[PDB]
């Protein structure tokens, strides 16, 4: 197995690999979410589809569970993994516990997954 | 010992299951549901070992739901039934096998109404009508007698009535209440529970 | 159960303990394992208690009958054979391992007989759960033509050995001495353990026990 | 148990060991396994102690009566047959091999094996648990026409070796010699016992 | 053992016996068969004592971890489900536990039955143990959702006491609990034999 | 085949008072119908506040006591304090259950003092089910010791007895009497009786001879 | 070991004033058959402790090399520390229980004699992990035959001289040869003292067979 | 166990010119109890009683078949039976079924007719007699009864104190047995009178 | 598995038995009687092995009838019950034992109402109330709860009602019909069969 | 199977029989059970044929390597230890007794028994099913300091007697003699075989 520390601390106290990943999201498509009183609404942009491309495939709004959905920005290839890992966790939370997933729990899982990838070897 | 039954029509699938949750010699529940919602048009009815049934049924249920989330569309009744068959057959020659007898009922937008029978050994067979449990030995002949592939929903419930009445008269076990549901074009509809 | 037989110059001596165990719990702390057969013949019983008792009493009864018809002092060799054939008939189902010793016109004789019907004649032997301990002592300190007093002491020592070393053996040691002149049965010849003493008095003032119903029939 | 019977011109030699054992414990290190069926007939005991003693007693009884009816000392063949018959009638019920050897006027000193309820006459026979270890010895150490004393050495030797090898055999060696003149009974104590390779 | 739980208008009540047996001998007569997970969570014990204690206490640990992480406490449904999965991990291994999970949550009063097999059910009434048949008998006859706390306590006592009378492996004292919107309250710990004499008159 | 277990006998008893705890046992170690040794006390010091009594398979008893001894050190290096009577009882439960599918053939009874100074007794089964109680007996003669204690200490089956609180003097005599009665009937009980008394001062041991047959 | 092949019978032990004495016959039995009548069942661990073993001989020889290496390893360090008789007993208890718990036991019953710090040591180790200390020890059939003799002498006289312990042991080997079918009349005597371990050559107990004539 | 099927507890004690005999009142099959007022102590005459513990059928059978032989004895002989003679009669009755025995262990307790002398004994399921000067116990809680009797019994007890001792011995031993209880019946036997008492035992 | 029950009052005995004749998994009969008339006031209710029950019950029935013919008067409930006990106990240690669980109810002109319980092992016990079968485990507690020795016939049938309703609700086997009869001063009276 | 190894001054003698049997049928009446571990080390095979051959091959392999690493012919003790170790590591899994005998410079001709995974050195050893019947013979027929030819007679005799007694032993006798000079391998045919008492 590949055992090399990818993300390490810098002399000034910075995690460059994490900061470069934050440069990748800043290059990503514009995504906005806003909570209302009765409903919640997401909105994604910077689509720039060549009109020669089927836009049904490149949709940046994904449903994780019956009551949970998400929008992303940055490396669209990376998103697919996180989305599908969250979708598996949605059904695992439904298997281990009778209750459906709370919005905070899914967010906590996605956050813990992203955190693990900053402190693990080889990735 | 539990009971399952399915009757497929020209454009619908009628399914029924007993509502008894039994332990040794006592009836713990009068209103236990043995049906599992997989999709908007798929139902899985499970019977067998006490702890093995629910764990297995929910595992498949959550994976069919996982497919819906990952793709935006639901599995076909055939693809769903073949998925449940694969999972059971792979556990057959293992240290812990699942002793579950199940019945999958569904409606496809292309193929139409479907009813699948499956062993605890994981042998899959499509049938116009099927029944699980010891009550099947008393009811499959009645089904053989009055079944036509062009049976109406009105007659199907009446045919189910004839089968459930036989379980009250001849079958040694007490099964007073049954869950009855119909799957078609519009989906799953909860129908009046048959009590005796 | 530890039982032993010893042959000495003037006669024989038989020993037994007094412990009867039911399951792994002690039922009788004072039972008689030395059995009357003839005035000058006694038998020590180990095995199933009921079997040893009844087999012994059967032999004793037959021996009395024999003596009555014969009109002569019974032979120990006769007793041994009676026992064997009866025991052999039952294929070891009568759990009686016995040490039979007596005095004859033919002298003092010691036999051991097994529940399956085998018998053997010898100067000294020990049977039962504690036989190992008793045989050890006899093997160690037995000389032929021992004086009665030395024989008395050795037998006691042999049986005592079984009492302490064995869990199914306990109580007092009983000895029976058989000489041409007489047979002296000494119950409680030696008692290694005496605990009469209790520290607490568990007495109850009348009325402590709650009674629902009382009925008295006068006589 | 190791038992042996050897045949010579004047009569026979019957040998035994002194031990009976219950599993790994010995219950009698001094047991005479040589029982007389008649004045001139002896048998060697092996197998279940109870069964062997029971057969020995009946054989002696029937032969005693047989002798009186004929008013002649029983033939050894006759003796051997009664033992064979009792052993065979109850092969499943009785576990014993008895070697019957003795002397009669008609045929002299004779040796019979009754193991399993069969009848065979041999120049010499061995029986018991101990016999297994001496099969080789006896085959190499046997010569025709050995004198009474040569026969005694032979049976004593064989049994000694068996006793040392076998856990179920031990004690002293009991020996009887049957001749027209009478019965000679002798015992060999451990100190008297022959010595061979021990280690 | 004998264990019962039922719910009515005023909540859920739980009653158990206090007897422990090894073969035909009585190991204990003071045995506590109720585990107080939380102020509003309750668990009963039947089957193998060690199996009940360890696992239900392990559930209790996980209920505690749940409360710390989200700071909201745990639903009865979720709690019972957790316990079910633990037994599901240890299948075919001869673990023996029959238990019920009592609580009050957002859904309301909650009663569940959980099994060593992994069986999980929700219901108005449950009884687990060697004497559950007897408990069911008195419970079923004389039960209505329209009960007063005093009447419910009568039924709990009554059920257990009669069960202990008939059953060899049930006896000792009746431990009763009441589950209220706020939390559980321990009603009583009354000797069964004394109750039975009282009923005899 | 091969059996991993042997029955070695031995009975252990514990009683709790207001400021004392008593752990008592016979000194007999046996196997089958033979006695291994007459000098084998089942009581063992863990701390100045807690004493353990093990009975059953001696092979398990020796290994289990050594595990507890090591776990007591592991705790005090990590927590900077001695393990409490209740904490040892809670720990023993988990250690016994970790062998659910290959159990210690062992009957443990813990006797000591709680954090308030009051007497505490914990009774265990071979698998790890435990609770606190006033008095409990465990082992080959536990069925002989129990009913007398139920009557005297628990005041059971009695009508107008004024319910006198348990003293050390009375409990000591109770401990002696039941073991003298047990030695008369149980073949695995005898030789000598060792009594361990847990008080605020510490552990004190006392020996009274028994039947040696 | 599931089924033992070549086995050794009872091993004796009793501690006198200023040391301990151990006895074991030089027999290796294959079932009932006496296979090897000149094999040592006793070893010298170091200068303070000795060991006699019953049961499977192949398992004894395995434990003989493991203990043998442990003494070698300790002598190499030369730090002024050596294994005490109690330490060997403690190790052996842990070794036997560990093998027992893995359901693959060493088929052995051990007697460990030792002398250290002016005190005599005698320890018992079973194949299941049963361990204790006693003034006198006897394994197998010795526990039923020789042990009752030792206890009865030690009751009347707790302290023995080396000569008294030797003649008691020789008396016990006589009883063992008479009553054990799996025994032999060729044995060794090992002794620990202030001077160390001394194992004596092939010995034979004096036998009397005069009771062979007392059946008529 | 075959004895464990029905359960039961029978106990006898000795005192100053008097004897006491007690038994539990339970009749039950393994899991459940059927009857609260089951009889286990049977009178074999005035001042002589037998208590039977074990399998309920054999308890009833032996009692009936012993009465058969007792009445014939009391008619052929011109006398009432001596306690030693009854012991030997039960011993013979039980041993006749040596290889197919009645699953019951009887307890004889009574005073000798004419000679006043107290007598107590217990027997095997195959008829082995045990005579003591103190107490005899039989049943599923043998160990529990032994533990009480050894601690409670005294050499010379008056009828008032003997009843209290034999009761407390039965009460607490039964409370530790799962297959014995539902009340305890005590018979106190004197020359002048016989006192029969049912005790306030645990009904669980 | 069958069911028997008896309730004794101050001057009467109420008895009830199920009417199911079951084979493997089927109910062969809805109206099978498990009561046997021994005398004008004696009833014997038998349960157990299929062929053993009727043969044994009729054998005792014919012998009680034989006693009536040979003497001019009938056996007392006690003498009858002790006779059935003797016959079963003698066959216990034989090559062919009878596995029958029975309940004898009778009315004596001197002693009054009587109810006897008996094992297949042949242990006899007189009880104020008793029940046979697996249903006894569910009903004996209800009987313990509401029974008083001074119960009226009106309340006895109502108490029986409470017990039979429990068998419908909790008991796993289907026992819809029951034979109900009362024995008193006037004899045996056939009462309305309780159907569900 | 009957196997024998005898020790003399110059070296050793290893003996075997020729038969392998499957129950009551013989599958090879001509089988050499004498396998060489090394130039001067031989072993005698008994037990499971497959297991014995499997151990023999591994022992020869390890010793071959051992020899090369030391650049000296392996000690016989060393040879015996490897066989003992393989037998002991798998006592439950492998059913074989191998007798290892040979010659080395340090200690001369030596004989080792590895039955059951133990190590013992003997003046001579026997193994196999046939050994039971010759225990007596060998104890009486052994003398210290027998010459090579005396040793050959001894092993041949013993095995011959065992072969005739034993059903699992038969065929011809295979003999090897190991000395400082080399290995002498000879076979004794039935006609050459020694004669004793047969009937
Ligand atoms: Cl007789
Ligand atoms: Cl005693
Ligand atoms: Cl033979
Ligand atoms: Cl409590
Ligand atoms: Cl640990
Ligand atoms: Cl370990
Ligand atoms: Cl050899
Ligand atoms: Cl071999
Ligand atoms: K859900
Ligand atoms: K021959
Ligand atoms: K919490």
Curated annotation (Swiss-Prot), chain A:
Give the record's GO CC terms: cytosol; nucleoplasm; proteasome core complex; proteasome core complex, alpha-subunit complex
Q: Which GO terms describe its molecular function?
A: identical protein binding
* Tissue specificity: Detected in liver (at protein level).
Keywords on record: Acetylation, Cytoplasm, Glycoprotein, Nucleus, Phosphoprotein, Proteasome
Q: How does it assemble?
A: The 26S proteasome consists of a 20S proteasome core and two 19S regulatory subunits. The 20S proteasome core is a barrel-shaped complex made of 28 subunits that are arranged in four stacked rings. The two outer rings are each formed by seven alpha subunits, and the two inner rings are formed by seven beta subunits. The proteolytic activity is exerted by three beta-subunits PSMB5, PSMB6 and PSMB7. PSMA7 interacts directly with the PSMG1-PSMG2 heterodimer which promotes 20S proteasome assembly. Interacts with HIF1A. Interacts with RAB7A. Interacts with PRKN. Interacts with ABL1 and ABL2.
From the Swiss-Prot or TrEMBL record, state where the protein is found: Cytoplasm; Nucleus
The PTM entry states: Phosphorylation by ABL1 or ABL2 leads to an inhibition of proteasomal activity and cell cycle transition blocks.
Species this protein is from: Mus musculus (Mouse)
Q: Does the keyword 4Fe-4S apply?
A: no
User: What triggers expression?
Assistant: Up-regulated in liver tumor tissues.
Protein name in UniProt: Proteasome subunit alpha type-7
Could you tell me the Gene Ontology terms of the biological process aspect for this record?
A: ubiquitin-dependent protein catabolic process
Name the family: Belongs to the peptidase T1A family.
Main localization is cytoplasm
Looking at the keywords, is Glycoprotein present?
Answer: yes
Curated annotation (Swiss-Prot), chain C:
What does it catalyze?
Cleavage of peptide bonds with very broad specificity
Keyword set includes Aminoacyl-tRNA synthetase: no
**Cell location:** Cytoplasm; Nucleus
Tissue expression notes: Detected in liver (at protein level).
Write out the function statement from the record.
The proteasome is a multicatalytic proteinase complex which is characterized by its ability to cleave peptides with Arg, Phe, Tyr, Leu, and Glu adjacent to the leaving group at neutral or slightly basic pH. The proteasome has an ATP-dependent proteolytic activity. This subunit is involved in antigen processing to generate class I binding peptides. Plays a role in determining the T-cell repertoire for an antiviral T-cell response.
* Protein name as it appears in the record: Proteasome subunit beta type-10
Name what induces it.
Up-regulated by interferon gamma (at protein level). Up-regulated by IRF1.
| Key words, A-Z | Acetylation, Cytoplasm, Hydrolase, Nucleus, Protease, Proteasome, Threonine protease, Zymogen
Member of which family?
A: Belongs to the peptidase T1B family.
- Please list the GO biological process terms of this entry: cell morphogenesis; proteolysis involved in protein catabolic process; T cell proliferation
Instruction: Reproduce the UniProt comment on modification after translation.
Output: Autocleaved. The resulting N-terminal Thr residue of the mature subunit is responsible for the nucleophile proteolytic activity.
The disruption phenotype is: Impaired response of cytotoxic T-lymphocyte (CTL) to dominant epitopes of lymphocytic choriomeningitis virus (LCMV).
For this UniProt entry, the molecular function terms from Gene Ontology, in alphabetical order, are: threonine-type endopeptidase activity
In short, the EC number is 3.4.25.1
UniProtKB/Swiss-Prot annotation, chains D, J:
* Annotated family: Belongs to the peptidase T1B family.
Post-translational modification (record): Autocleaved. The resulting N-terminal Thr residue of the mature subunit is responsible for the nucleophile proteolytic activity.
Natural source organism: Mus musculus
Chain's gene name: Psmb9
The EC number on file is 3.4.25.1
Function (record text): The proteasome is a multicatalytic proteinase complex which is characterized by its ability to cleave peptides with Arg, Phe, Tyr, Leu, and Glu adjacent to the leaving group at neutral or slightly basic pH. The proteasome has an ATP-dependent proteolytic activity. This subunit is involved in antigen processing to generate class I binding peptides. Contributes to NFKBIA degradation and subsequently NFKB1 generation.
**Self-association and partners:** The 26S proteasome consists of a 20S proteasome core and two 19S regulatory subunits. The 20S proteasome core is composed of 28 subunits that are arranged in four stacked rings, resulting in a barrel-shaped structure. The two end rings are each formed by seven alpha subunits, and the two central rings are each formed by seven beta subunits. The catalytic chamber with the active sites is on the inside of the barrel. Component of the immunoproteasome, where it displaces the equivalent housekeeping subunit PSMB6.
Lineage, top-rank taxon, reads: Eukaryota
Q: Where is the active site?
A: 1
**Could you say which enzyme class this protein belongs to?**
hydrolase
Which named protein is this?
Proteasome subunit beta type-9
Catalytic reactions on record: Cleavage of peptide bonds with very broad specificity
Tell me where it resides. Cytoplasm; Nucleus
Q: Which residues carry this modification: N6-acetyllysine?
A: 33, 89
Curated annotation (Swiss-Prot), chain H:
Q: For this UniProt entry, what's an example GO CC term?
A: proteasome core complex, beta-subunit complex
Question: SUPFAM superfamilies, alphabetically?
Answer: N-terminal nucleophile aminohydrolases (Ntn hydrolases)
Q: Which UniProt keywords apply?
A: Acetylation, Cytoplasm, Nucleus, Proteasome
Q: Which PROSITE patterns match?
A: PROTEASOME_BETA_1 (PS00854), PROTEASOME_BETA_2 (PS51476)
The entry's note on the tissues where this protein occurs is: Detected in liver (at protein level).
Task of the protein: Non-catalytic component of the 20S core proteasome complex involved in the proteolytic degradation of most intracellular proteins. This complex plays numerous essential roles within the cell by associating with different regulatory particles. Associated with two 19S regulatory particles, forms the 26S proteasome and thus participates in the ATP-dependent degradation of ubiquitinated proteins.
The protein's name? Proteasome subunit beta type-3
Q: Which organism is it from?
A: Mus musculus (Mouse)
Q: Which gene encodes it?
A: Psmb3
């Amino acid at each position: 197995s590949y055992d090399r520390a990818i993300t390490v601390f810098s002399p000034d106290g910075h995690l460059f690999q994490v900061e470069y990943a934050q440069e990748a999201v800043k290059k990503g498509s514009t995504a906005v979410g806003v909570r209302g009183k009765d409903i919640v609404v997401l909105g994604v942009e910077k689509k720039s589809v060549a009109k020669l491309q089927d836009e049904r495939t490149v949709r940046k709004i994904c449903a994780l569970d019956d009551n949970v959905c998400m929008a992303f920005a940055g490396l669209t290839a990376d998103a697919r993994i996180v989305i599908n890992r969250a979708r598996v966790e949605c059904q695992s939370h439904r298997l281990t516990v009778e209750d459906p997933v709370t919005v905070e729990y899914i967010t906590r899982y996605i956050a813990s997954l992203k955190q693990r990838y900053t402190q693990s070897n080889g990735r | 010992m539990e009971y399952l039954i399915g009757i497929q029509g020209p454009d619908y699938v009628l399914v029924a299951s007993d509502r008894v949750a039994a332990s040794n010699i006592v009836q713990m529940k009068d209103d236990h549901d043995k049906m599992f919602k997989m999709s908007e048009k798929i139902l899985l009815l499970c019977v067998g070992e006490a702890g093995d049934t629910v764990q297995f049924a929910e595992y498949i249920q959550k994976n069919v739901q996982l497919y819906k989330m990952r793709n935006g569309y639901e599995l076909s009744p055939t693809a769903a039934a073949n998925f449940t068959r694969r999972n059971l057959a792979d556990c057959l020659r293992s240290r812990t096998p699942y002793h579950v007898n199940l019945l999958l009922a569904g409606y496809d937008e292309h193929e139409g109404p479907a009813l699948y029978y499956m062993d605890y050994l994981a042998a899959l067979a499509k049938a116009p009508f099927a029944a699980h449990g010891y009550g099947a030995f008393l009811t499959l002949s009645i089904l053989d007698r009055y079944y036509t592939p062009t049976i109406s929903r009105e007659r199907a419930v009446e045919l189910l009535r004839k089968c459930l009445e036989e379980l009250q008269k001849r079958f040694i076990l007490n099964l007073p209440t049954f869950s009855v549901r119909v799957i078609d074009k519009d989906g799953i509809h909860n129908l009046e529970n048959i009590a005796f | 159960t530890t039982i032993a037989g010893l042959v000495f110059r003037d006669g024989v001596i038989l020993g037994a303990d007094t412990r009867a165990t039911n399951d792994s719990v002690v039922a009788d702390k004072s039972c008689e394992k030395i059995h009357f057969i003839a005035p000058k013949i006694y038998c020590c019983g180990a095995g199933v208690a009921a079997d040893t008792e009844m087999t012994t009493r059967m032999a004793a009864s037959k021996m009395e009958l024999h003596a009555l018809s014969t009109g002569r002092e019974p032979r120990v060799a006769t007793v041994t054979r009676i026992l064997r054939q009866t025991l052999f008939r039952y294929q070891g189902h009568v759990g009686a391992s016995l040490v039979v010793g007596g005095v004859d016109l033919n002298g003092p004789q010691l036999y051991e007989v097994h529940p399956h019907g085998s018998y053997s004649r010898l100067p000294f032997t020990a049977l039962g759960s504690g036989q190992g301990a008793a045989v050890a002592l006899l093997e160690d300190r037995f000389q032929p033509n021992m004086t009665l007093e030395a024989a008395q002491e050795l037998l006691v020592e042999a049986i005592t050995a079984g009492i302490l070393s064995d869990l199914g053996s306990g109580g007092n040691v009983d000895a029976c001495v058989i000489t041409a002149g007489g047979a002296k049965l000494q119950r409680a010849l030696s008692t290694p353990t005496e605990p009469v003493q209790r520290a607490g008095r568990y007495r109850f003032a009348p009325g402590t026990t709650p009674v629902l119903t009382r009925e008295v029939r006068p006589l | 148990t190791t038992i042996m019977a050897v045949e010579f011109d004047g009569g026979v030699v019957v040998g035994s060991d002194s031990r009976v054992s219950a599993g790994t414990a010995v219950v009698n290190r001094v047991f005479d396994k040589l029982s007389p069926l008649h004045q001139r007939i002896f048998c060697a005991l092996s197998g279940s102690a109870a069964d062997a003693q029971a057969i020995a007693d009946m054989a002696a009884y029937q032969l005693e009566l047989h002798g009186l009816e004929l008013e002649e000392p029983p033939l050894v063949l006759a003796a051997a047959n009664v033992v064979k018959n009792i052993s065979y009638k109850y092969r499943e019920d009785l576990l014993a091999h008895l070697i019957v050897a003795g002397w009669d006027q008609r045929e002299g000193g004779q040796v019979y094996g009754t193991m399993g309820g069969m009848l065979i006459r041999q120049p010499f026979t061995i029986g018991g648990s101990g016999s297994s270890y001496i099969y080789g010895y006896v085959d190499a150490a046997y010569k025709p026409g050995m004198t009474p004393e040569e026969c005694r050495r032979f049976t004593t030797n064989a049994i000694t070796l068996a006793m040392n090898r076998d856990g179920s055999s031990g004690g002293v060696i009991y020996l009887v010699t049957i001749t027209a003149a009478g019965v000679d009974h002798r015992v060999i104590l451990g100190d008297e016992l022959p010595k061979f390779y021990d280690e | 053992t004998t264990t019962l739980a039922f719910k009515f208008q005023h909540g859920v009540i739980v009653a158990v016996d206090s007897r422990a047996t090894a073969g035909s001998y009585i190991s204990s007569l003071r045995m506590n068969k109720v585990i107080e997970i939380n102020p509003y969570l309750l668990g009963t014990m039947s089957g193998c004592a060690a199996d009940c204690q360890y696992w239900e206490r392990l559930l209790a640990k996980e209920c505690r971890l749940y409360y710390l992480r989200n700071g909201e406490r745990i639903s009865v449904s979720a709690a019972s489900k957790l316990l079910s999965n633990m037994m599901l991990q240890y299948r075919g291994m001869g673990l023996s536990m029959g238990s019920m999970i009592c609580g009050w949550d957002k859904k309301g009063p909650g009663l569940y039955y959980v099994d060593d097999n992994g069986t999980r059910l929700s219901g108005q009434m449950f009884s687990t143990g060697s004497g559950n048949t007897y408990a069911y008998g008195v419970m079923d006859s004389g039960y209505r959702q329209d009960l007063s706390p005093e009447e419910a306590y009568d039924l709990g006592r009554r059920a257990i006491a009669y069960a202990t009378h008939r059953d060899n492996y049930s006896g000792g004292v009746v431990n009763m609990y009441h589950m209220k919107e706020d939390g559980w309250v321990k009603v009583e710990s009354s000797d069964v034999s004394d109750l039975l004499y009282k009923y005899g008159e | 085949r091969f059996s991993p277990y042997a029955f070695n006998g031995g009975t252990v008893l514990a009683i709790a008072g207001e400021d004392f705890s008593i752990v008592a046992s016979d000194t007999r170690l046996s196997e089958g119908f033979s006695i291994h040794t007459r000098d084998s006390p089942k009581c063992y010091k863990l701390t100045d506040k807690t004493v353990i009594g093990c009975s059953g398979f001696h092979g398990d008893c020796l290994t289990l006591t050594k595990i507890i001894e090591a776990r007591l050190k592991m705790y005090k290096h990590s927590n900077n304090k001695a393990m409490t009577t209740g904490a040892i009882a809670a720990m023993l439960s988990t250690i016994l259950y970790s062998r659910r599918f290959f159990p210690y053939y062992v009957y443990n009874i813990i006797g000591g003092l709680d954090e308030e100074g009051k007497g505490a007794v914990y009774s265990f089964d071979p698998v790890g089910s435990y609770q606190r109680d006033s008095f409990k007996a465990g082992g080959s003669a536990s069925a002989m010791l129990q009913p007398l204690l139920d009557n005297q200490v628990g005041f059971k089956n009695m009508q107008n007895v004024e319910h006198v609180p348990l003293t050390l003097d009375r409990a000591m005599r109770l401990v002696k009497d039941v073991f003298i009665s047990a030695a008369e009937r149980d073949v695995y009980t005898g030789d000598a009786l060792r009594i361990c008394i847990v008080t605020k001062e510490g552990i004190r041991e006392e020996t009274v001879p028994l039947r040696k047959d | 070991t599931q089924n033992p092949m070549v086995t050794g019978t009872s091993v004796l032990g009793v501690k006198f004033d200023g040391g301990v004495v151990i006895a074991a016959d030089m027999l290796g039995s294959y079932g009932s058959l006496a296979r090897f009548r000149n094999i040592s069942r006793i070893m010298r661990v170091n200068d303070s402790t000795m060991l006699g073993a019953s049961g499977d001989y192949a398992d004894f020889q395995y434990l003989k090399q493991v203990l043998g290496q442990m003494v070698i390893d300790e002598e190499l360090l030369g730090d002024g520390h050596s294994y005490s008789p109690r330490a060997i007993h403690s190790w052996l208890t842990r070794a036997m229980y560990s093998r027992r718990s893995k359901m693959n036991p060493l088929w052995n019953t051990m007697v460990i004699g030792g002398y250290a710090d002016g005190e005599s040591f005698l320890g018992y180790v079973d194949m299941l992990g049963v361990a204790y200390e006693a003034p006198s020890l006897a394994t197998g059939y010795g526990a039923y035959l020789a042990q009752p003799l030792l206890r009865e002498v030690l009751e009347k006289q707790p302290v023995l001289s080396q000569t008294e312990a030797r003649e008691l042991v020789e008396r016990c080997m006589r009883v063992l040869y008479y009553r054990d079918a799996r025994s032999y009349n060729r044995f060794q005597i090992a002794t620990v003292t202030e001077k160390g371990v001394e194992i004596e050559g092939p010995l034979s107990a004096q036998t009397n067979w005069d009771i062979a004539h007392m059946i008529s | 166990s075959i004895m464990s099927y029905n359960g039961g507890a029978v106990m006898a004690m000795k005192g100053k010119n008097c004897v006491a005999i007690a038994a539990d009142r339970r009749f039950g099959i393994q899991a459940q109890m059927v009857t609260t007022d089951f009889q286990k102590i049977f009178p074999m005459g005035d001042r002589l009683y037998i208590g039977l513990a074990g399998l309920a059928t054999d308890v009833q059978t032996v009692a009936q078949r012993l009465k058969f032989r007792l009445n014939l004895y009391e008619l052929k002989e011109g006398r009432q039976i001596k306690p030693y003679t009854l012991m030997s009669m039960v011993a013979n009755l039980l041993y006749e079924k040596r290889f197919g025995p009645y699953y019951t262990e009887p307890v004889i307790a009574g005073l000798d007719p004419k000679t006043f002398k107290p007598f107590i004994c217990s027997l095997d399921l195959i008829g082995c007699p045990m005579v003591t000067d103190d107490f005899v116990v039989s049943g599923t809680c043998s160990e529990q009864m032994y533990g009480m009797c050894e601690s409670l019994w005294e050499p010379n007890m008056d009828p008032e104190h003997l009843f209290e001792t034999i009761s407390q011995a039965m009460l607490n031993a039964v409370d530790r047995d799962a297959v014995s209880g539902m009340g305890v019946i005590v018979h106190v036997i004197e020359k002048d009178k016989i006192t029969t008492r049912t005790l306030k035992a645990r009904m669980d």
